[PDB]
Write an enzyme that holds these catalytic residues in place. Structure first.
Site, PDB file in Angstrom:
ATOM      1  CG  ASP A   1      15.888 -11.631  88.491  1.00 58.30           C
ATOM      2  OD1 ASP A   1      14.744 -12.421  88.824  1.00 58.30           O
ATOM      3  OD2 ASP A   1      15.956 -10.693  88.286  1.00 58.30           O
TER       4      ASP A   1
ATOM      5  CB  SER B   1       0.975 -24.979  87.320  1.00 60.84           C
ATOM      6  OG  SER B   1       0.386 -25.744  88.353  1.00 60.84           O
TER       7      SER B   1
HETATM    8  C1  LIG Z   1       8.156  -5.869  98.874  1.00 61.54           C
HETATM    9  C2  LIG Z   1       7.354  -6.605  97.762  1.00 61.54           C
HETATM   10  C3  LIG Z   1       5.768  -5.913  97.434  1.00 61.54           C
HETATM   11  C4  LIG Z   1       7.082  -8.235  97.883  1.00 61.54           C
HETATM   12  S1  LIG Z   1       8.112  -6.122  95.984  1.00 61.54           S
HETATM   13  O1  LIG Z   1       7.454  -6.687  94.799  1.00 61.54           O
HETATM   14  O2  LIG Z   1       8.513  -4.801  95.639  1.00 61.54           O
HETATM   15  N1  LIG Z   1       9.600  -7.202  96.135  1.00 61.54           N
HETATM   16  C5  LIG Z   1      10.261  -7.079  95.078  1.00 61.54           C
HETATM   17  C6  LIG Z   1      11.854  -7.799  94.972  1.00 61.54           C
HETATM   18  C7  LIG Z   1      12.590  -6.992  95.987  1.00 61.54           C
HETATM   19  C8  LIG Z   1      12.715  -7.494  97.415  1.00 61.54           C
HETATM   20  C9  LIG Z   1      13.655  -6.723  98.115  1.00 61.54           C
HETATM   21  C10 LIG Z   1      14.431  -5.615  97.790  1.00 61.54           C
HETATM   22  C11 LIG Z   1      14.156  -5.248  96.326  1.00 61.54           C
HETATM   23  C12 LIG Z   1      13.637  -6.132  95.479  1.00 61.54           C
HETATM   24  C13 LIG Z   1       9.786  -8.031  93.884  1.00 61.54           C
HETATM   25  O3  LIG Z   1       9.292  -9.164  93.956  1.00 61.54           O
HETATM   26  N2  LIG Z   1       9.896  -7.371  92.520  1.00 61.54           N
HETATM   27  C14 LIG Z   1       9.464  -8.164  91.209  1.00 61.54           C
HETATM   28  C15 LIG Z   1       8.105  -7.679  91.025  1.00 61.54           C
HETATM   29  C16 LIG Z   1       7.602  -7.974  89.930  1.00 61.54           C
HETATM   30  C17 LIG Z   1       7.640  -8.975  88.925  1.00 61.54           C
HETATM   31  N3  LIG Z   1       6.649  -8.759  87.893  1.00 61.54           N
HETATM   32  C18 LIG Z   1       6.095  -7.678  88.195  1.00 61.54           C
HETATM   33  N4  LIG Z   1       6.568  -7.165  89.482  1.00 61.54           N
HETATM   34  C19 LIG Z   1      10.576  -7.978  90.205  1.00 61.54           C
HETATM   35  O4  LIG Z   1      10.277  -6.863  89.534  1.00 61.54           O
HETATM   36  N5  LIG Z   1      11.417  -8.809  89.879  1.00 61.54           N
HETATM   37  C20 LIG Z   1      12.680  -8.672  89.145  1.00 61.54           C
HETATM   38  C21 LIG Z   1      13.816  -8.892  89.824  1.00 61.54           C
HETATM   39  C22 LIG Z   1      14.096  -7.959  90.846  1.00 61.54           C
HETATM   40  C23 LIG Z   1      14.112  -6.410  90.713  1.00 61.54           C
HETATM   41  C24 LIG Z   1      14.414  -5.657  91.715  1.00 61.54           C
HETATM   42  C25 LIG Z   1      15.604  -6.190  92.615  1.00 61.54           C
HETATM   43  C26 LIG Z   1      15.633  -7.390  92.961  1.00 61.54           C
HETATM   44  C27 LIG Z   1      15.406  -8.302  91.840  1.00 61.54           C
HETATM   45  C28 LIG Z   1      12.387  -9.853  87.978  1.00 61.54           C
HETATM   46  O5  LIG Z   1      13.562  -9.652  87.081  1.00 61.54           O
HETATM   47  O6  LIG Z   1      12.417 -10.963  88.455  1.00 61.54           O
HETATM   48  C29 LIG Z   1      11.422  -9.713  86.952  1.00 61.54           C
HETATM   49  F1  LIG Z   1      11.225 -10.871  86.302  1.00 61.54           F
HETATM   50  F2  LIG Z   1      10.081  -9.689  87.695  1.00 61.54           F
HETATM   51  C30 LIG Z   1      11.603  -8.750  85.787  1.00 61.54           C
HETATM   52  O7  LIG Z   1      11.295  -7.466  86.012  1.00 61.54           O
HETATM   53  N6  LIG Z   1      11.956  -9.076  84.956  1.00 61.54           N
HETATM   54  C31 LIG Z   1      12.730  -8.464  83.883  1.00 61.54           C
HETATM   55  C32 LIG Z   1      12.661  -9.246  82.290  1.00 61.54           C
HETATM   56  N7  LIG Z   1      13.017  -8.140  81.264  1.00 61.54           N
HETATM   57  C33 LIG Z   1      12.542  -8.500  80.009  1.00 61.54           C
HETATM   58  C34 LIG Z   1      12.673  -7.722  78.976  1.00 61.54           C
HETATM   59  O8  LIG Z   1      14.429  -7.857  78.773  1.00 61.54           O
HETATM   60  C35 LIG Z   1      14.932  -7.248  79.947  1.00 61.54           C
HETATM   61  C36 LIG Z   1      14.428  -8.216  81.191  1.00 61.54           C
END
Ligand SMILES: CC(C)(C)S(=O)(=O)N[C@@H](Cc1ccccc1)C(=O)N[C@@H](Cc1c[nH]c[nH+]1)C(=O)N[C@@H](CC1CCCCC1)C(O)(O)C(F)(F)C(=O)NCCN1CCOCC1
Length: 329
Positions: free
Chosen positions: A35, A198
Site C-alpha cells: 500500500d 498530473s
Molecule cells: C470495494 C471498494 C468500494 C472499491 S473500496 O474503496 O472499499 N476498496 C478498498 C480496498 C479494499 C479492497 C478489497 C478488500 C479490502 C479493501 C479501498 O480502495 N480503500 C481505500 C479507500 C479510500 C482511500 N481514501 C479514501 N478512501 C483505502 O482506504 N486505502 C488505504 C489502504 C487499504 C485499506 C483497507 C485494506 C486494504 C488497504 C490507503 O492506505 O491506501 C489510504 F491511502 F487510502 C489510506 O487510508 N491511507 C492512510 C494514511 N494515514 C495518514 C495518517 O497516518 C496514518 C496513515
C-alpha cells in the site's frame, strides 16, 4: 541487492492485490497488501483477538529473530473506515528475495470487521513515506526505507495486472516490462504520500485539457478518484451512465463499450483502456456495473488507485528528493 515478487488480484474484480512476505526465522509467509498510501507493516498475529481472526497469522514467539520493541504501540485507520492496533516487534522480513533485518512488524491485537471478513489479506505492507507510520512513541521505518542502504538503486516498481498477476520489484528497473520510456514527475512529501500533479486528461478520442490535478499514487486504493468536473466529463461519454445515490457512485450498463481515459505525466500520456474502467457488476449477474472512475469530492484528495496504476509501469524513486515515473506497457 534486489527483490522481485509476484502480486495477484484477490478476486475477479481486482479489488486489491496481495504479495507474499516472509517474516521471522524460520520464515512465516503471509500475503500482504502492498500500500503506497500508508506506512505501517502490520499483520494478523497470534496476539489478535481470536474472534476477529477468520487469515494466516504471524506468531512472534515462533521466530528466533523477533524482538519486542519495548513500550511501542500502534493504531491506524484507513480512508474506507477500517482500523487495527497492537504492539511492535522488530524481525527479519523478506520480499521477493530481498531481506531486511530489524524491520518493525506491527502485530495486531485487534482488527476491524472488514479485515476479519477478507480472508485473502493477512495484513498490510506500507510503502508511503515513513512520516505516516503510526508507531508511538518513535515512528518506525518502512520496508523500503530499511532496504535502501543495500538496494542496487533506491527504487521500487509496481507493475499491476488487469485481472492478471503482476510484479513488485525492489532495487532495479526492468527495461523489458514497459514500452517507450519512463517520464518522471516531481513528488511532494508534505502530506507523507507519493503526491504529484498530473498535467491534465482526455476522455476517449477527445481533447487533452491542461488542468493540473494534484493527487497520490496509491496501490492500496482500488479505483481512480478524480475531481467531480473531470469525472462528469468522462461519464458524459457513456450513454447509460448515471450517478447513483444509493450505490455510491457512477453506474452504467455492463454491456457498454467504455471510452479510454488518458492522464498526463508531464508531456507524456498514460492511456487507461476503457475496459479497465469497468470495475464490474454491482452484484453477480446484474446488468449494471460500477464505474472505475469516481469523484474524489467525498474523500477530499485525488487518488490514482489501481484502475490507473495497472495501466502503467510505475517507478517509486526514493532518492533523497523522491520522484515518480510512469511508462506505458
Ligand atoms: C470495494 C471498494 C468500494 C472499491 S473500496 O474503496 O472499499 N476498496 C478498498 C480496498 C479494499 C479492497 C478489497 C478488500 C479490502 C479493501 C479501498 O480502495 N480503500 C481505500 C479507500 C479510500 C482511500 N481514501 C479514501 N478512501 C483505502 O482506504 N486505502 C488505504 C489502504 C487499504 C485499506 C483497507 C485494506 C486494504 C488497504 C490507503 O492506505 O491506501 C489510504 F491511502 F487510502 C489510506 O487510508 N491511507 C492512510 C494514511 N494515514 C495518514 C495518517 O497516518 C496514518 C496513515
Amino acid at each position: 541487492s534486489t527483490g522481485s515478487a509476484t502480486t495477484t488480484p484477490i478476486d475477479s474484480l481486482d479489488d486489491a492485490y496481495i504479495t507474499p512476505v516472509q517474516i521471522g526465522t524460520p520464515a512465516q509467509t503471509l500475503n500482504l497488501d502492498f500500500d503506497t498510501g500508508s506506512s505501517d507493516l502490520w499483520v494478523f498475529s497470534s496476539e489478535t483477538t481470536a474472534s476477529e481472526v477468520x487469515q494466516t497469522i504471524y506468531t512472534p514467539s515462533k521466530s528466533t529473530t523477533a524482538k519486542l520493541l519495548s513500550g511501542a504501540t500502534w493504531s491506524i485507520s484507513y480512508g474506507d473506515g477500517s482500523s487495527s492496533s497492537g504492539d511492535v516487534y522488530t524481525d527479519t522480513v523478506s520480499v521477493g528475495g530481498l531481506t531486511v533485518t530489524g524491520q518493525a512488524v506491527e502485530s495486531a491485537k485487534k482488527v476491524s470487521s472488514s479485515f476479519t471478513e477478507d480472508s485473502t489479506i493477512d495484513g498490510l505492507l506500507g510503502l508511503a513515506f515513513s512520516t505516516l507510520n503510526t508507531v508511538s512513541p518513535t515512528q518506525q521505518k518502512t520496508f523500503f526505507d530499511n532496504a535502501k542502504a543495500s538496494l542496487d538503486s533506491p527504487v521500487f516498481t509496481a507493475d499491476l495486472g488487469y485481472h492478471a498477476p503482476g510484479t513488485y520489484n525492489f532495487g532495479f528497473i526492468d527495461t523489458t516490462a514497459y514500452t517507450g520510456s519512463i517520464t518522471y514527475t516531481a513528488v511532494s512529501t508534505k502530506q507523507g504520500f507519493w503526491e504529484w500533479t498530473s498535467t491534465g486528461y482526455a476522455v476517449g478520442s477527445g481533447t487533452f485539457k491542461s488542468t493540473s490535478i494534484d493527487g497520490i499514487a496509491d496501490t492500496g486504493t482500488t479505483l481512480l478518484y478524480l475531481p467531480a468536473t473531470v469525472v462528469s466529463a468522462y461519464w458524459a461519454q457513456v450513454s447509460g451512465a448515471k450517478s447513483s445515490s444509493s450505490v455510491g457512485g457512477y453506474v452504467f450498463p455492463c454491456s457498454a463499450t467504455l471510452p479510454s481515459f488518458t492522464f498526463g505525466v508531464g508531456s507524456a500520456r498514460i492511456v487507461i483502456p476503457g475496459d479497465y474502467i469497468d470495475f464490474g457488476p454491482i452484484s453477480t449477474g446484474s446488468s449494471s456495473c460500477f464505474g472505475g472512475i469516481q469523484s474524489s469530492a467525498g474523500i477530499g484528495i485525488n487518488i490514482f488507485g489501481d484502475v490507473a496504476l495497472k495501466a502503467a509501469f510505475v517507478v517509486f524513486n526514493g532518492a533523497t528528493t523522491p520522484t515518480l515515473g510512469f511508462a506505458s506497457k
